[PDB]
Amino acid sequence: TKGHIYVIDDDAAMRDSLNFLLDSAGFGVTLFDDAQAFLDALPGLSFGCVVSDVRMPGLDGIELLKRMKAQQSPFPILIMTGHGDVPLAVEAMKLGAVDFLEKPFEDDRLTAMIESAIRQAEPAAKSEAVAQDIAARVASLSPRERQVMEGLIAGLSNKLIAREYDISPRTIEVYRANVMTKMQANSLSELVRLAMRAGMLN
Ligand SMILES: [Mg+2]
Numbered sequence: 001t002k003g004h005i006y007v008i009d010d011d012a013a014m015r016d017s018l019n020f021l022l023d024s025a026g027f028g029v030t031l032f033d034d035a036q037a038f039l040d041a042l043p044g045l046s047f048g049c050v051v052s053d054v055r056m057p058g059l060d061g062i063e064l065l066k067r068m069k070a071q072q073s074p075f076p077i078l079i080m081t082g083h084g085d086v087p088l089a090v091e092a093m094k095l096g097a098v099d100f101l102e103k104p105f106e107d108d109r110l111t112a113m114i115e116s117a118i119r120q121a122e123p124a125a126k127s128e129a130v131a132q133d134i135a136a137r138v139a140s141l142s143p144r145e146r147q148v149m150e151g152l153i154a155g156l157s158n159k160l161i162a163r164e165y166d167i168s169p170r171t172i173e174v175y176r177a178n179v180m181t182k183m184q185a186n187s188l189s190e191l192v193r194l195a196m197r198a199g200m201l202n
Contacts, residue, residue, distance in 0.1 A: 002026035003118045004048035008038050008056050008064075009080070018051060021107040027114065035059035042071060047125050049114050054081040054089050054100070061092030061100075069096065074124040076117035078110075134198045137183050145182065148175035152188060153195040 005027050007018050015031045022029050028048075032038040035058035050068070054061040061079045068077060079100035081089040089100035098117040101110055141149060144167070151161035162169035185191040195201055 001028045003114065004028040004030070004046065005114065006030050006032065006038065006045065006048050006050050006075075008032045008035070008050065008052040008059070010034075010053060010057060014053070014080070018110075021110070022114075025107070025111045027111075039067065042067075042073065045075075047122075048075060049118050049121075050075050050077045051110075051114070052077065052079060054079045054085050054092065061089055061097065062095060065092050065095035065097055072128070074121055074128055076121035078113060078117060131197050134183075134194050137194075138198055138200070141179060141182055145175050145179045148172060149179045149183070149191070149195070150200070152176060152179070153192045153201065 002025065005018075005022050007015055007022075007029060009015050009018070009031075010033060012033070015033060019029050019031060030041075030045075030048075032041070035056055038059070050064075052059070052061065052064050056064070059067070061081070065077065068075065076098045077092075077096075079089045079092050079097050080103060081100050082103050086100070086102055089097075089102075093100065098120065099113050101113065138146075138149075144165075147165040147167070148161060151164060156164060158169055158172045161167070161172055167175070179185075180191065183191055183194055185194055192201075
């Protein structure tokens with residue numbers, strides 16, 4: 001499939017149009033006629049592009065952009081607006097929507113817009129996937145390796161790590177080697193970067 005689209009709109013006419021033009025274009029589709037049906041589903045939705053009514057009851061463009069950011073979703077979001085509501089869509093753009101379409105619109109404008117939005121959002125998809133794995137790599141260290149790693153990324157030398165965590169200075173190099181291989185880090189430098197993505201530096 002060419003991408004999956006989650007459509008949110010209380011107008012059955014719109015849901016039916018979009019389901020048609022998107023299927024006839026090769027995308028998968030899930031329709032939500034109800035705001036909390038979409039929210040209830042969001043934490044186990046796989047990656048896809050959201051196409052939402054800018055004035056969905058309960059979940060307008062601003063409201064949706066805030067809940068998507070709060071749930072830290074990398075799903076790109078397109079906003080469907082009527083001409084009178086474009087000021088509202090603009091506020092959704094300032095909160096990170098990818099684009100908006102004012103109604104009526106041509107189908108190929110929307111499909112083009114969807115392809116582009118999916119292409120632009122896949123780096124942050126892959127990024128959050130990598131942050132997931134990094135967290136798993138951290139979780140897998142032994143408590144002594146977690147100690148050495150905390151030290152290294154805090155900037156401590158071999159001896160300061162050794163007297164802070166009370167470890168023979170002759171074995172730091174060894175827990176460091178184990179940390180590096182389990183973190184798949186090629187240098188202190190990269191180990192600290194991995195730590196930052198993991199949120200162990202704040
Ligand atoms: Mg509506």
